[PDB]
Ligand binder design. Sequence first.
Ligand SMILES: *[C@@H]1O[C@H](CO)[C@@H](O[C@@H]2O[C@H](CO)[C@@H](O)[C@H](O)[C@H]2NC(C)=O)[C@H](O)[C@H]1NC(C)=O
Ligand SMILES: *[C@@H]1O[C@H](CO)[C@@H](O[C@@H]2O[C@H](CO)[C@@H](O)[C@H](O)[C@H]2NC(C)=O)[C@H](O)[C@H]1NC(C)=O
Ligand SMILES: *[C@@H]1O[C@H](CO)[C@@H](O[C@@H]2O[C@H](CO)[C@@H](O)[C@H](O)[C@H]2NC(C)=O)[C@H](O)[C@H]1NC(C)=O
Ligand code: EIC
Ligand code: NAG
Ligand code: NAG
Ligand code: NAG
Ligand code: NAG
Ligand code: NAG
Ligand code: NAG
Ligand code: NAG
Ligand code: GE9
Lengths: 170, 339, 48, 48, 411
Amino acid sequence: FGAISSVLNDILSRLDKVEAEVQIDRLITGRLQSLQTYVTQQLIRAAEIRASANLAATKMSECVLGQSKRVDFCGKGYHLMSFPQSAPHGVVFLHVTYVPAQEKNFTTAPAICHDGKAHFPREGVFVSNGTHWFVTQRNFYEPQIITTDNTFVSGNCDVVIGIVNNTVYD
Amino acid sequence: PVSMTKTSVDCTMYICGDSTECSNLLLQYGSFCTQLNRALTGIAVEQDKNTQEVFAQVKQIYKTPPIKDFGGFNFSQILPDPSKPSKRSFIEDLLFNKVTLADAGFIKQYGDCLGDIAARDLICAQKFNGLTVLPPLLTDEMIAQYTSALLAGTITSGWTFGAGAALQIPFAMQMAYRFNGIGVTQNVLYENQKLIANQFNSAIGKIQDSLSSTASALGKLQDVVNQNAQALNTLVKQLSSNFGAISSVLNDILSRLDKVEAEVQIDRLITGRLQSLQTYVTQQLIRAAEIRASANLAATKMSECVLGQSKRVDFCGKGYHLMSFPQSAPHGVVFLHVT
Amino acid sequence: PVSMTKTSVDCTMYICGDSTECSNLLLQYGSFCTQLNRALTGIAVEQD
Amino acid sequence: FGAISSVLNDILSRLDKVEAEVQIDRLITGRLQSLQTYVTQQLIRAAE
Amino acid sequence: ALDPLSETKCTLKSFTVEKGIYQTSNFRVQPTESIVRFPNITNLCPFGEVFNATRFASVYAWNRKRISNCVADYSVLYNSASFSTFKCYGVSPTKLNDLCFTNVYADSFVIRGDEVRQIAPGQTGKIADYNYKLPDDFTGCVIAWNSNNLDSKVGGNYNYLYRLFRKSNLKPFERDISTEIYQAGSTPCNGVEGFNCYFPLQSYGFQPTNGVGYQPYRVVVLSFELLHAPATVCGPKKSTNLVKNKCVNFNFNGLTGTGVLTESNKKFLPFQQFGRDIADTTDAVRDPQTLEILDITPCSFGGVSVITPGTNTSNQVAVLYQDVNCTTWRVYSTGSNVFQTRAGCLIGAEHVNNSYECDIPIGAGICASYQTSQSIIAYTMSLGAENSVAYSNNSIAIPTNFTISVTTEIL
Ligand SMILES: *[C@@H]1O[C@H](CO)[C@@H](O[C@@H]2O[C@H](CO)[C@@H](O)[C@H](O)[C@H]2NC(C)=O)[C@H](O)[C@H]1NC(C)=O
Ligand SMILES: *[C@@H]1O[C@H](CO)[C@@H](O[C@@H]2O[C@H](CO)[C@@H](O)[C@H](O)[C@H]2NC(C)=O)[C@H](O)[C@H]1NC(C)=O
Ligand SMILES: *[C@@H]1O[C@H](CO)[C@@H](O[C@@H]2O[C@H](CO)[C@@H](O)[C@H](O)[C@H]2NC(C)=O)[C@H](O)[C@H]1NC(C)=O
Ligand SMILES: CCCCC/C=C\C/C=C\CCCCCCCC(=O)O
Ligand SMILES: *[C@@H]1O[C@H](CO)[C@@H](O)[C@H](O)[C@H]1NC(C)=O
Ligand SMILES: *[C@@H]1O[C@H](CO)[C@@H](O)[C@H](O)[C@H]1NC(C)=O
Ligand SMILES: *[C@@H]1O[C@H](CO)[C@@H](O)[C@H](O)[C@H]1NC(C)=O
Ligand SMILES: *[C@@H]1O[C@H](CO)[C@@H](O)[C@H](O)[C@H]1NC(C)=O
Ligand SMILES: *[C@@H]1O[C@H](CO)[C@@H](O)[C@H](O)[C@H]1NC(C)=O
Ligand SMILES: *[C@@H]1O[C@H](CO)[C@@H](O)[C@H](O)[C@H]1NC(C)=O
Ligand SMILES: *[C@@H]1O[C@H](CO)[C@@H](O)[C@H](O)[C@H]1NC(C)=O
Ligand SMILES: NC(=O)c1cc(I)cc(I)c1I
C-alpha cells in the first residue's frame, strides 16, 4: 500500500515511532479499504441471497403448500405438487407436473347448429372422427356424445364463423 | 430492461497507461485488479444469463405459418417480415430505432482512433484508457428469432407450447378459451368475433402510431445505456484528478522527479485511480443487481403472460388479461398485453 | 416498507466546512462529489 | 486519518500552506471515503 | 509474457486453467526508438555572468537577471565553482539535464553564513521577512557558496546592506529599497533618526577573521517553470530526428512519454506549447524545431481474450482480438486459422458452417468448442430445433395420453 513493507514487524524493527507512523498509517488505510471492499461485496451478495430466499419462500408457499396456476413457477407443465428437500445452504424443490404426451389430430368446430341454434361445449371442445361429432376435454381426449347437458345454446347459427351442422342423437 | 452493457477493465492500462515504473509500483497491489475483473466478469456473464432466461424459455423454434388465417386477427405487424435483412418485426424495427446505442458495433480498430479522433471520440478515449465493452452472446437477430418462435407458438398453439408438445388450435377457439378464462362465456367471443378482431387491429395500429411518433416511451432502456456510458465517461474523466500529487500526469512526474521523489506521487495516483475503479465496479454491481431483478420479472412475465393466461391483477396489463406478445428491444423486452 | 429518507450531501461543507484553503484543495477532486450527489439524487427520486 | 489533527482550523492555525497541504489532503481523502461508504450503503438499502 | 495462455495462468495465479474464455491485458505495442526534440540552441548559459560576477547586490536590493536562449550545462561549474548549499524544490537535481526551463530568473545577493538557511519557501527571520522571501510554491534551485575570499575586507567590508525594522513582512519575490526612517515608538519621526527612529538599512561586518556564521555568502536563486510553456532554456541534451507514425519514446522540451506522433490539424496559439485533453494528458505538442503541431496517440489499444479447452485437456488456445479485421495486423501471433467474427479477429480456431449448442461463449452469436485430430472449432450457436405447428382454422391437437414429470429446482 505504498509502504516500505507489508509487515508491521519489519517496520517496527527498523524504524522508530515517528518514521514508522507513516508506514503503519499507510498499511492501516490499505487494510481498512480491503475490509470495506469485502463488506460491500458481502452486502451485495447478501441482497442477492435474500432475493433468492424470498423466491424460495414464495415457491414453498405456492408450490408445496398449494397448487400453483402460474406457468413455469413450479416446474415445466401443469403443476400438480411439489416436495421440499433440504440442501447445504439451500432448498431443492421436486416439482411433480402434468405433461401431455401423445397428441392426435382432430377436426374441430367453434359451434354446432342443431335446430337453428348455436351450441357450445362450455367445458371443452367439439371434435369429429370423420362422421359424428363428440365433445371432449381440452387436456385429455375423452370424447362424449353431444347432449344438452354438456352444451349450452346461444343465439342463431348465422353469426358464428365456422359453425357446422350435426344432429343430436338420443 | 433485461441486460446491461458488459464491460472489462485493464487496470494496468487505466492506472498507469504505458509507464513501466508505474506498472512496477502497481505490482505491489495485484489482487485488487483481479478482484475488480472477477466482479466485472461475473456481471458480464450474468447479463447473457439474464438474456437467456428472458428469451430462451422455449428451446424449440417455431417459425411463422404461411396461411396466416387467424379469424380476422392481423399479426403480420408483430410477426417478422422476410423483406428486411434482419428477420425482426416492424414494431421491433421501431423499438430498435428509438434506442440509440453508444457505439454502432463492438469492434473499433486502431486506425479509426489513430490521430485527433482519439481526443474527440468517447469510445476511443475509453479504449485507450483500458475500458472495453464486450458484445452480448446473443445477437439482436437471435433474440428476434426467439421472439418470433414465442409469437408463433402463442398464435398457433396458444398456451400448450409453454407446457411442451405444442398443440395446434384455431385462433378463434383459443380466444374463446381465454374469454372463458376471464369469466366471459365463449359465445360472446363468437358473436362479436369481427368486432374483437377489429379492436385488436386498431389497438395494434395505435401502438404503431405511438411508437412511430416523436414520443419515445422507451426511456427505461435508454436510461440503462446512458448510465453505462456515463459511468465509463466518468471513469475516463477522473484520470485528471491529482489525488494530492503534484500532477495528475505520470509523464510529468517521471520527467521532473527521480525514482524516490516520484514514487510517492505515483503511489498517490495509483491509490486514487484504484479507488475510482473500485467505485465504478461497486456501482456496476449494484446496477447489475437491479438489472437482474428486472430480468427476473421479465422472465416471470414471459412465462405467465405469454406462455399462459395470468389471473394476477395488473401483472400482464390493466384489465382482465387475455394474452401477451413479446418483442425484442435493445437491452430489453417489450410486452404487448392484450386485455 | 415503501420508501426511505431522501438525503442530500454538500460535500464541500462536510469535508471542508467554511475553510477556503480546503475548498481550493478539494477542487482537484471535483467529480467524486458530483458522482455521490448523482447517486443520492437517484435514490431520492426512486423513493417518490 | 493519519493527519496531526482532525480539525482543519488547528492545522491551518499551526502550519503554513505547504505543511498543512498534506494534512488537509489526508483529511479530504478520509472524509471522501466516508461519504463514498455512506452513499454505497444508501444505494444498497435503496435497492432493498 | 511467453504467450496469452501463460498470461491467463499468471492472472488466475494457478498452473491449471479451466475451459472457457478469459480476458487478458490489452494489446501492448512497445516503442521502437527514442527521440529528443529541443530547440536548437548553441550558446552556453551565462554561468560566468552569474556565479563569477565581480560584484554582488545587497540582499535588500537583490538583483534579478533574465536567462533565455541558452543551454543549461552546469557541469562547466564543476572545475571552479564549489557550492556549500544546492537545494532544488520543484525538480529533482538528476533530472535537470533532461529538462527545458520556461521562465528562468537568477536572483543574486550576499548574506551572512547563518542566514543561508533562511532562503527557503517557508522560513522566518530577518532576511526572510524584510529582505527576500520565496513563495510557498517556489519551483527552482537555491545555490549558496562562501565568498569570504572576495567579499571580506581587512578593515571591514560595509558595502553589503540588509533591511532591518520593516513595518510588515515582504511578499514573495518583492523588493523594498526605500530608506524611510522607521518609527518604532509612538513618537512619529520627521526624517530624523533618534530614540525610537532608526535607519532601516544596516551593513554587515564581513571581516576575514569573522566566524563562518558571519562570513559573506553569495546566493543565487534560480526560478523557472516546467513543462507548461514553450520554454527557451534547455539542458545539454542532443536532439534527434522527428519520427512520425510509429510508436516511439519522445522527449519534447523535457516532457517525456511514449506514443505515436502524427501530423495535427490543431492551430496552437503563439504562447502555447502543449495541448491537453479532458484527462489532462498531453495529447498534442508543438515541435520546438519545425514549429509544427503533432498529435500524440497511445500505442496500446484493443482488448484481447484467450479461449482454452482446459489445460487438463489440451494446451491449444485461440486468441480473440476484439478490435480487428483479419483483413501488419495488431495481433500477437497470426497463423492459418483466421475467421473474423463479430467481436474481433479469431486466430487459432477452425470455422464450420454448422450450428451447435454453445460451449465456450465467444460472443456476438459465436461459440467455440474443442472437437475432433482434436482442435478448437468456432461456430454460430444454434437457438434450438425448428419445426412447424400444423395450424388450421378447423384442426385441433388433443393429447391422448400424459407424462408425470418430476423436475428439481435448486435455490
Ligand atoms: C395487416 O396490417 C397491415 C398493416 O401493417 C396491412 O397492410 C396494409 O394494407 C393496406 C391495404 O390493404 C395498405 O394500404 C397499407 O400500406 C398496408 N400496410 C403495410 C403493408 O404496412 C394488411 O393488409 C393487414 N392484413 C389484412 C389481412 O388485412
Ligand atoms: C360496443 O363497442 C363497439 C366498439 O367500441 C361498437 O362498435 C362501433 O360502433 C360505432 C357506432 O356507435 C361504429 O361507428 C363503429 O364502426 C363500431 N366499431 C366497429 C369496430 O365496428 C359497438 O357499437 C358497441 N355496442 C355494441 C352493442 O356492440
Ligand atoms: C503595500 O502597500 C500598501 C499601501 O502602501 C501597504 O498597506 C499599508 O500598510 C501600512 C502598515 O503596514 C498601513 O499603515 C497603511 O494604512 C496601509 N495602506 C493601505 C492602503 O493598505 C502594504 O502593507 C504594502 N505591502 C507590503 C507587503 O509591504
Ligand atoms: C547561469 C544561469 C543558468 C540557469 C539554468 C536553469 C536551470 C538549470 C539548473 C541548475 C543549474 C545550476 C546548478 C549549480 C550546482 C551544480 C552541481 C554542484 O556543483 O554541486
Ligand atoms: C397433424 O397433421 C399435420 C399435417 O396436416 C402433421 O404435420 C402433424 O404432425 C399432425 N399431428 C399429429 C399429432 O399427428
Ligand atoms: C366414429 O366414432 C363412432 C363411435 O365412436 C364409430 O361408430 C364410427 O365408426 C367412427 N368412425 C370413424 C370413421 O372412425
Ligand atoms: C376454414 O376456412 C375455410 C376457407 O377455405 C372455410 O371454407 C371453412 O368453413 C373454415 N372453417 C372453419 C371451422 O372456420
Ligand atoms: C347447415 O344448415 C344450414 C341451414 O339449412 C345451411 O344453410 C348450411 O349450408 C348447412 N351447412 C352445411 C355445411 O351443409
Ligand atoms: C570563473 O572564474 C575563474 C577565474 O577567473 C575561472 O577559472 C573559471 O573558469 C570561471 N568559471 C566560469 C564558469 O566562467
Ligand atoms: C532551428 O529551429 C528553428 C526554429 O526556431 C527552425 O526554423 C530551424 O529550421 C532549426 N534548424 C535546424 C538545423 O533544425
Ligand atoms: C472490418 O472492416 C471491414 C471493411 O473492409 C468491414 O466490412 C467489417 O464490418 C469490419 N469488421 C467488423 C467485425 O465489422
Ligand atoms: N458441440 C459442438 O460444438 C460440436 C459437436 C460435435 I458431435 C461436432 C462438432 I465439429 C462440434 I463444433
